[PDB]
Structure 1
Amino acid sequence: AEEFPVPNGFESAYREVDGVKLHYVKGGQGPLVMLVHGFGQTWYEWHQLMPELAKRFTVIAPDLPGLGQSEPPKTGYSGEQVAVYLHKLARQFSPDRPFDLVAHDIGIWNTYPMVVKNQADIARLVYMEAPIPDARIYRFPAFTAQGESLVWHFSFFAADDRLAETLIAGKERFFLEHFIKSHASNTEVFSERLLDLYARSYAKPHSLNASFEYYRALNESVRQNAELAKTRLQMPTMTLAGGGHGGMGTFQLEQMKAYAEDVEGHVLPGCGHWLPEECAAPMNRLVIDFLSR
């Protein structure tokens, strides 16, 4: 059974990595590009970009441990632990060449440590719509003059007592729709069918828990990154962020400047947090052009 429809010419498959069965969708020919999704989603958020990229690259889009059809991590959910799985998965398919990495949302948290620790393995890097976990996140406000902030979920999801699983269970579809649309500019792209598919996936009890364990490990990830960041990133990097409601605006590039020697950034007007779906055509174009250099 597949949680999401696989594009033509792609295959849904699994690899064991350090005793954890990871799911991915793979297609194309050429140098490897790995696309890593974030919270509330799965490999499927990349399904529009994948066929275009597959004209020039071998494309792999894994499900993060515990999410989609991937088994939970056996080590832990901190960025350094999760990044091992993703790095080793990429290396199974690109053992002899560096590969490209594109990540969205918590896909950034789960890849940054393997990028900085294995720079020779990373040809080009694209990061969109999430802070790298560091002390900057402690400044985001709990509440705004316009009401509900965009970041209060960091605390909701990190809270103990399984607070988030307990309140969201039985209301997974309701909560996800609220979360996705409140972080969107272009809500129309989230059809009832698309929301149904994402909700069914993250509502699997181990996946609902996995979702929040990423946040329960966030402080540990920040502490980890405090040490890792002593080494600057040297590979060509591009950042993307939405400039509309729900988006991160200038933060993405400005943070990345502290991490990378060679970075260019774009802010996409009229687009929120969910760039691959809200603004597929220009996002796809920018990613394809940057990687095709």
Structure 2
Amino acid sequence: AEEFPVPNGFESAYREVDGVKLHYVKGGQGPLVMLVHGFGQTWYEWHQLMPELAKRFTVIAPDLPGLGQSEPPKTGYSGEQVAVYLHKLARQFSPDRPFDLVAHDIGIWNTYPMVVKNQADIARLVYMEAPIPDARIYRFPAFTAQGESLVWHFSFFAADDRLAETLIAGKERFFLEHFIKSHASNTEVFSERLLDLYARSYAKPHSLNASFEYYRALNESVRQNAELAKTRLQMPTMTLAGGGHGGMGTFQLEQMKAYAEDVEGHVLPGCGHWLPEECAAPMNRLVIDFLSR
């Protein structure tokens, strides 16, 4: 059973890592690039980019622990804990050469620690559409002159009493459509068909709970990153952000400058949070070109 259609010439498989069964989709030949998805989605967000990359690279796109078809983590949901699973997974496929990394949203939270702790293992890096967990996240507004703010859901998801699961259980499809479209500029790409696919996956009770545990570990991740960030990233880095409704805008690059010696940033106009889907052509081009250097 596959929750999402595997692109032609790719394989859907599993790898046990530190006692946790991770799902991934793999294809292509050459140096390894790992694509890491974010909240509300799965490996599938990369399905348009993967075939193009596979012409030049071995491409792997894992489901985050607890999400998609991956088992929940056995340690915890903090960035440093989850990063161990992903680092080891990647190294199974690339034990003797560095690999490339592309991450979106909370995929960033869950990879940053393994990047900074294993810089030699990372050839090139692309981060898009999410803050690295640090003190900056405490400066985002709860509410804006336009209406709901970008990250009020941080509090909603982090709240005690399993507030989010209790309210959202049984209404996953409704909530995800609102969440996704409210963070989008090009909302039309989110057909009812596509939303059905994503909603069915995160409606798995352990997946719905896992989703929110990432936010419940967010403050811990911030504390972890305060130590780790004492060493800057040395490898070539690119940031992408949407310049349209729901996007991070200039924040993405500006924060990254504090973390990386070598960074170039792009803000994509008319695109919100969901770059791979809202703005596939320019995003795919930017990523392929950067990794192909």
Paired with 2:150 and 2:204, the residues of 1 have a C-alpha distance of: 25
User: What secondary structure does 2:265 align onto?
Assistant: strand
User: What secondary structure does 1:271 align onto?
Assistant: coil
The alignment's C-alpha RMSD in Å is 0.3
Paired with 1:140 and 1:91, the residues of 2 have a C-alpha distance of: 35
Of all paired residues, the percent bearing the same amino acid is 100
User: What secondary structure does 2:88 align onto?
Assistant: helix
Instruction: Give the Å deviation of 1:38.
Output: 0.2
Structure 1 gap ranges (5+): none
Do residues 269 (structure 1) and 269 (structure 2) align?
Answer: yes
Paired with 2:277 and 2:253, the residues of 1 have a C-alpha distance of: 21
Paired with 1:42 and 1:146, the residues of 2 have a C-alpha distance of: 30
Deviations 1:94-140 (A, max 9, x none): 00000000000000000000000000000000000000000000000
Instruction: Give the Å deviation of 1:27.
Output: 0.1
In the superposition, the TM-score normalised over structure 2's length comes to 1.00
User: What secondary structure does 2:131 align onto?
Assistant: coil
Name 1:90's counterpart in structure 2: 90
Instruction: Give the Å deviation of 1:147.
Output: 1.2
Paired with 2:73 and 2:93, the residues of 1 have a C-alpha distance of: 20
Paired with 2:131 and 2:146, the residues of 1 have a C-alpha distance of: 22
Deviations 1:33-79 (A, max 9, x none): 00000000000000000000000000000000000000000000000
User: What secondary structure does 2:21 align onto?
Assistant: strand
Name 2:185's counterpart in structure 1: 185
Aligned length: 293
User: What secondary structure does 1:272 align onto?
Assistant: coil
Instruction: Give the Å deviation of 1:150.
Output: 1.5
Name 1:30's counterpart in structure 2: 30
Instruction: Give the Å deviation of 1:226.
Output: 0.1
User: What secondary structure does 1:101 align onto?
Assistant: strand
Paired with 2:115 and 2:146, the residues of 1 have a C-alpha distance of: 37
Deviations 1:257-281 (A, max 9, x none): 0000000000000000000000000
After TM superposition, the structure 1 = structure 2 runs for residues 217-228 of structure 1, keeping only pairs within 5 Å, are 217-228=217-228
Paired with 2:182 and 2:204, the residues of 1 have a C-alpha distance of: 23
Deviations 1:164-193 (A, max 9, x none): 000000100000000000000001100111
Deviations 1:172-219 (A, max 9, x none): 000000000000000110011100000000000000000000000000
Paired with 1:262 and 1:167, the residues of 2 have a C-alpha distance of: 43
Paired with 2:13 and 2:93, the residues of 1 have a C-alpha distance of: 13
Structure 2 gap ranges (5+): none
Name 1:245's counterpart in structure 2: 245
Paired with 1:170 and 1:18, the residues of 2 have a C-alpha distance of: 32
User: What secondary structure does 1:27 align onto?
Assistant: strand
In the superposition, the TM-score normalised over structure 1's length comes to 1.00
User: What secondary structure does 1:85 align onto?
Assistant: helix
Instruction: Give the Å deviation of 1:149.
Output: 1.0
Name 1:106's counterpart in structure 2: 106
Instruction: Give the Å deviation of 1:148.
Output: 1.0
User: What secondary structure does 1:150 align onto?
Assistant: coil
Instruction: Give the Å deviation of 1:146.
Output: 1.0
Paired with 1:170 and 1:203, the residues of 2 have a C-alpha distance of: 8
Paired with 2:9 and 2:146, the residues of 1 have a C-alpha distance of: 46
Paired with 2:256 and 2:10, the residues of 1 have a C-alpha distance of: 32
Paired with 2:105 and 2:146, the residues of 1 have a C-alpha distance of: 23
User: What secondary structure does 1:212 align onto?
Assistant: helix
Name 2:161's counterpart in structure 1: 161
Name 1:14's counterpart in structure 2: 14
